[PDB]
Amino acid sequence: GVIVELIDHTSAIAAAKDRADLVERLRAAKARISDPQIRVVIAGQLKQGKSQLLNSLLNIPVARSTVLATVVSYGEQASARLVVARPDGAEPELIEIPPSEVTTDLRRAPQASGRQVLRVEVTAPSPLLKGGLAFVDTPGVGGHGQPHLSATLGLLPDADAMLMISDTSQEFTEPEMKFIRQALEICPVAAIVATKTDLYPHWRQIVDANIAHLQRAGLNVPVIPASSVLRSHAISLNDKELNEESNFPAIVKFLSEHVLSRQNDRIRDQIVDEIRSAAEHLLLAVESELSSFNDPGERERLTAELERRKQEAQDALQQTALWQQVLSDGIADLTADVDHDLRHRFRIIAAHTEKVIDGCDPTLHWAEIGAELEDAVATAVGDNFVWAYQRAEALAAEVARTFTEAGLDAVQMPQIDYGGVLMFGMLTSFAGLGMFNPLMENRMLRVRNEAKANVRKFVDDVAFVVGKESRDRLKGIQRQLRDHYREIANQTTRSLNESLQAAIAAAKVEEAERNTRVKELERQQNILKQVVDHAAKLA
């Protein structure tokens, strides 16, 4: 549309002036708006009907039972790739894979060569996904041998929305409620889908009750009833009649009005700012040369200024640069603080459990004791992760201000006279739910004491496991932010060095060909300004 033409124009200008850095930047911006990747996470516990919901939604059997996070996005032809982790927070690796593989256990897909597979990304030719919606199927959780529901939080920082699937067999359990509040801390745009309305006749009150609950508990989430079963019948008989009846259109409007529409506005704004910034980088050299022509007596101040801003832009690429110091020290600090937070939470949990143990015959309540512990530990991991996420955002925010405070992105004339692979995946704590089940005054003492001891290592082992991922995660964040600002510093360094020589080369021209040169600089200047002002307000 207008933006494409705008991008098109600007890019053309950047290429004739040999600004290869701006063209690629504009190439990335253009790529962002056609493949927006608007990720919507489909969450919820075991047996609630999530996968059937996704299949009924997209009309395609790509979804499945699943053991690995699966991202479904638009592609004319079916295709699939594995997102494979690299050590020490390095950028994950994409590995194409034949579609026949998605059906079974890529957790240890041979192509992965023993590395941890974070997720699978597959394509599907569903008219629903063309606009840029991408659905993240989550593995089975809440069951024996499965992750806790809070493990789903690891998918949300990179998500734009969440659909919380909760079936209508009974009202919300406490774990569902704690998870919803935690999820909203990271991903505010969310909705509850009350599934299986077709199977349970009293489904109605439960939705209202749950709805009550949220308001009473302060959780702002809309509830959308639905039946995947009716939808499936609907495809078959070509009956719209059933579709209003399935209430699936209600799911789409929320996806349209609260997810797709909200995010599209946000994508256009960042791309217009990208166009404006690129144009202004080009304008700097144009107006610097103009000043050198039209105002010869200020060449000293013009060049002295430009030289200063260039060095500062170059020093910003230094190990010692304040923004990089703040970043490096902040990540190191946050890493230690996050581990400290977790172990504080776990210690509180372990202490409670040990008291519980000394209060009964652990051998007569071991299943319930184990269950409470696994839930408490997994929830603490969730609370720790949310806290860590909030602190990382605050740190990232501080580094941006620090960068900005140095004028390392400023390209106005002096007045005189992440496109890489994301690292999001499931959280990890314990091997699985229901899997911690380890081996008169004397019997009781021996038994009670051993359980606790078993409990404290279990708690310690998880802290160990969680801490490594926390560490590599922060390293990944450090890498992404560093790459971002070194790129900007290089562009700014570049734009300032062109402006400097352009001002020098203009002072060597003679009277005969200055006026000819200026006129074309004003034509050029006017064009960028038209572009800048012209696209600045399509905000």
Numbering used by the authors: 0 to 63, 69 to 421, 457 to 478, 495 to 594
Give the authors' words.
Overall, the apo state of IniA adopts a very similar fold as the GTP state, with a root-mean-square deviation of only 0.525 Å. An IniA dimer with antiparallel packing of HB2 was found in the asymmetric unit. Symmetric interactions of a D333α7–R351α7’ salt bridge and D337α7–H344α7’, E402α8–H348α7’ hydrogen bonds are observed between the antiparallel HB2s.
IniA consists of an N-terminal GTPase domain and two HBs. Our results suggested that IniA, like other BDLPs, has weak GTPase activity and nucleotide-dependent dimerization in solution, but tends to form nucleotide-independent homotypic interactions on the membrane and cuts the membrane.
